[PDB]
Design a binder for this molecule. Structure first.
Ligand code: VI1
Length: 170
């Protein structure tokens, strides 16, 4: 999609981190960001969590693009990223691999994962390594705030989690 970056309705947590209680698919469609972040795995298999939602919204175009990327380039590393099409959601999708602590992956790589955001002026993003990836979402938000130095607009879907997360910044 042509970029518009129509961001509104966010709470400002820090100079550069904004957060909203939102479905990232519905938010991406309304914002048309330059970059939407996917909570990816190294083979870009878009199943549970944010990844399946973004892919479903593209009617599997993201998965077919991702399979072709993997065929040519092979898998990412944990903490790594690649830039692919944003399809109908964004100009670009930055597929970022946070460590999956459910799979015994090194939580220290969450810093590396969030560093990928710093390659981009502005992003719409979910929390990395939490949810199906098994890390504490409070820790994910802390690493995001400490590591991301560019303009990041966070969407958190679950209202109860959103309220608990933002409580410590109000
Ligand atoms: C912004 O996040 C989303 O919009 C979605 C998910 N977010 C998560 O899983 C986050 C993992 C990290 C911890 C925070 C979590 C959260 O944002 O609450 S899953 C998902 C969606 C799309 C909406 C439909 C529901 C099922 C597909």
């Amino acid at each position: 999609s042509m970029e518009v970056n129509s961001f509104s309705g966010y709470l400002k947590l820090t100079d550069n981190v904004y957060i909203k209680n939102a479905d990232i698919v519905e938010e991406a469609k309304k914002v048309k960001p330059t970059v939407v972040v996917n909570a990816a795995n190294v083979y870009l298999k878009h199943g549970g969590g944010v990844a399946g939602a973004l892919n479903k919204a593209t009617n599997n175009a993201m998965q077919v693009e991702s399979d072709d990327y993997i065929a040519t380039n092979g898998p990412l590393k944990v903490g790594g990223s690649c830039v692919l099409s944003g399809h109908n959601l964004a100009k670009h999708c930055l597929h970022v691999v946070g460590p999956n602590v459910n799979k015994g992956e090194d939580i220290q790589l969450l810093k590396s994962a969030y560093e990928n955001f710093n390659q981009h002026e502005v992003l719409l993003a979910p929390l990395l390594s939490a949810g199906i990836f098994g890390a504490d979402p409070i820790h994910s938000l802390r690493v995001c705030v400490d590591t991301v130095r560019t303009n990041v607009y966070l969407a958190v879907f679950d209202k109860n989690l959103y309220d608990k997360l933002v409580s410590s910044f109000l």
